[PDB]
Enzyme design. Structure first.
Site, short mmCIF file in Angstrom:
data_model
loop_
_atom_site.label_atom_id
_atom_site.label_comp_id
_atom_site.label_asym_id
_atom_site.label_seq_id
_atom_site.Cartn_x
_atom_site.Cartn_y
_atom_site.Cartn_z
N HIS B 84 39.20 32.92 45.61
CA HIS B 84 40.39 33.29 46.36
C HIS B 84 41.19 32.11 46.92
O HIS B 84 41.38 31.98 48.13
CB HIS B 84 40.04 34.27 47.48
CG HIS B 84 39.62 35.62 46.97
ND1 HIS B 84 38.30 35.98 46.84
CD2 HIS B 84 40.35 36.67 46.53
CE1 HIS B 84 38.23 37.20 46.33
NE2 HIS B 84 39.46 37.64 46.14
N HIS B 88 44.43 31.77 42.21
CA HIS B 88 44.25 33.20 42.01
C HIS B 88 45.56 33.94 42.27
O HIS B 88 45.93 34.83 41.50
CB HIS B 88 43.17 33.76 42.94
CG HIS B 88 43.20 35.25 43.10
ND1 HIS B 88 42.94 36.12 42.06
CD2 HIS B 88 43.45 36.02 44.18
CE1 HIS B 88 43.03 37.37 42.50
NE2 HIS B 88 43.34 37.33 43.78
N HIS B 124 49.49 37.86 49.04
CA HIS B 124 48.44 38.86 49.15
C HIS B 124 47.01 38.47 49.56
O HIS B 124 46.23 39.34 49.94
CB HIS B 124 48.42 39.74 47.89
CG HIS B 124 47.42 39.32 46.87
ND1 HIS B 124 47.68 38.36 45.92
CD2 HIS B 124 46.15 39.74 46.64
CE1 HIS B 124 46.62 38.20 45.15
NE2 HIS B 124 45.68 39.03 45.57
N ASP B 125 46.67 37.18 49.49
CA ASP B 125 45.34 36.73 49.89
C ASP B 125 45.39 35.55 50.86
O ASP B 125 44.43 34.80 50.99
CB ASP B 125 44.50 36.33 48.65
CG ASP B 125 43.77 37.51 48.03
OD1 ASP B 125 43.34 38.38 48.81
OD2 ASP B 125 43.61 37.56 46.78
N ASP B 237 45.58 42.17 40.56
CA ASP B 237 44.41 41.70 41.30
C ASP B 237 43.10 41.85 40.52
O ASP B 237 42.20 41.02 40.65
CB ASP B 237 44.33 42.42 42.65
CG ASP B 237 43.71 41.57 43.77
OD1 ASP B 237 43.74 40.31 43.71
OD2 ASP B 237 43.20 42.19 44.73
MG LIG Z 1 42.46 40.33 48.61
ZN LIG Z 2 43.51 38.96 45.26
#
Ligand SMILES: [Mg+2]
Ligand SMILES: [Zn+2]
Ligand SMILES: [Mg+2]
Ligand SMILES: [Zn+2]
Lengths: 333, 333
Positions: B84, B88, B124-125, B237
């Site tokens: 992550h 990614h 998103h992360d 994802d």
């Molecule tokens: Mg996530």
């Molecule tokens: Zn992700």
């Protein structure tokens, strides 16, 4: 041995698509595969047409039904890999047909031997997984282990032979059932000798043994016949570079992808990946073909043509023609 | 909000990405990372080219500089964890671009929604620390306690949203600054809805609702659009298994190393350590990938493709191809 159903046979008997001449050296199998939404049936029909058209099966007591059953039994044993699939063997069968009848090599063999060659082309790569002999040995895969213990390094070739024998054990698909005595024995032995001869590790000795059997006129005729059979299956097996460029190009794309997939599996197993199988290097397709042409194909075809198979001169011409075009591919860009 | 410097932007702008087509479904981010000694700038350049190439930022008043500032502000918030990390999210951005334009899903959304999806992929992360939601809850860590007390167990997802809002609160890095009224609200709410939907605990319900909406010709349009966006971010994802084998394998190795690091910390803290996070259990990758494919990825992609996203059929095809490849790894072990 799950026998073939009348339904399976019908799916094939319906094809026989027009506009195609399966006996022509310019025949395009890729075009044929894209002419219908059932390429596997068309491929089977092409093999069926080639064999019946030779008029050989009929002469050796092999009915049309048994022939079709055999073809379908073979088809079922090929996997969905990029290159060593059913299309490759149908192509080898078609190519051998051109060598024998357009190249006049049939003059050097008995009718039975020509029949065996066409049949053998269909079983020569049975159950190939898209991995070469080296993979099984390098990774110490079970089949590789067995090959080492048993004393034969031709891992896949022996496997293909085992399956060919399995298919022929069914009377409904035994294309050699109409044979007896020495003829039946020769059919099986010649078939097996030819498949075993496709192991490229024997390329040099096979070519040398042929040239020697062809040169020396005081040579054993029986030896010359068997070696000619082995050389013809070998020639068909590496004939991709002798086809019209567009066709040759597509075969090259297919073999390269399969090699790359072996390389990927080798990376997963943590073993050595040769450049030819290294997808990462993002190599030029043209470079690999020119290399194969220079070190393998060109010398092979030129030597067998000059030594005996004069009728196959076109293969040499096409190889040189394709090499020139591969150069332009790299050049013009 | 520490503004991005001219020197930082320049380091990205100097990357030309030779030999790469960021819009292709076979694009190799790992190859792109190994192409230079500054992978972080290359990755940023890839995201930059994807957004500009879409032609969307320009349409919504987002200048090239603000776009780049946004990308860099996002990059600064990703940590050096095995999976992550910034690569990614850039991968997710690139993957979503292919779903939208190679898969034609863009036809189901407005240009603003496509723009929001590509931007959302990058946030998103944010600030992921290599530990899943379960870790925080199991250990009763401060973040887990807050999530429980506040009523939302999507520990990390709410966190990522908070940081995204922070970055967009400065006009210099607000890719939505050119929006106002309803459009700006939709951009923020859709971005947040999508990030919250990435919590895998909601995988089944999210998929079910999308499929029910897709099957309903009278579904509320706004709701269908929102669910399509959520489904596409989710798809991006969990898209690792829809990529060429070697790329898919490399992602899987990163995922495993991150899981192993969590498992190690869980052991020291004396909390439950799932087999998948246990180094000692050394579970086989092939079985792990086939399991995820069979129970999660294959049905997810097949269902959304069949229900509405017909253009993404290739993901199903590749998942099938990759499964077969892992099966060959098992067969030859
Ligand atoms: Mg996530
Ligand atoms: Zn992700
Ligand atoms: Mg072979
Ligand atoms: Zn072959």
């Amino acid at each position: 041995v799950t026998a073939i159903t009348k339904v399976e046979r019908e799916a094939v008997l319906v094809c026989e698509l027009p506009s195609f001449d399966v006996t022509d050296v310019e025949f395009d199998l890729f075009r044929a595969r894209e002419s219908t939404d059932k390429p596997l049936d068309v491929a089977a029909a092409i093999a069926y047409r080639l064999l019946l058209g030779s008029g050989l099966p009929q002469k050796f007591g092999c009915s049309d039904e048994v022939l079709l059953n055999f073809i379908l039994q073979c088809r079922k044993k090929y996997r969905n890999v990029p290159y060593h699939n059913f299309y490759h063997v149908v192509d080898v069968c078609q190519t051998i047909h051109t060598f024998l009848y357009r190249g006049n090599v049939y003059e050097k063999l008995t009718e039975l031997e020509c029949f065996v060659l066409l049949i053998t082309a269909l079983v020569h790569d049975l159950d190939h997984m898209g991995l070469n002999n080296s993979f099984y040995l390098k990774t110490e895969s079970p089949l590789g282990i067995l090959s080492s213990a048993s004393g034969n390094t031709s891992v896949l070739e022996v496997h293909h032979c085992n399956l060919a024998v399995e298919i022929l054990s069914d009377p409904e698909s035994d294309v050699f059932d109409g044979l007896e005595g020495a003829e039946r024995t020769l059919a099986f032995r010649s078939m097996i000798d030819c498949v075993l001869a496709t192991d490229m590790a024997k390329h040099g000795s096979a070519l040398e043994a042929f040239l020697a059997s062809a040169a020396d006129q005081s040579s054993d005729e029986a030896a010359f016949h068997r070696m000619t059979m082995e050389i013809i299956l070998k020639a068909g097996d590496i004939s991709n570079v002798t086809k019209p460029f567009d066709i040759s190009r597509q075969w090259a794309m297919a073999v390269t992808e399969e090699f790359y997939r072996q390389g990927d599996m080798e990376k997963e197993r943590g073993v050595e990946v040769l450049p030819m199988f290294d997808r990462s290097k993002n190599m030029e397709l043209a470079k690999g073909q020119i290399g194969f042409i220079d070190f393998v194909a060109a010398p092979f075809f030129q030597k067998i043509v000059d030594a005996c198979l004069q009728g196959m001169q076109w293969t040499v011409d096409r190889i040189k023609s394709n090499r020139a075009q591969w150069e332009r591919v790299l050049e013009t860009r």
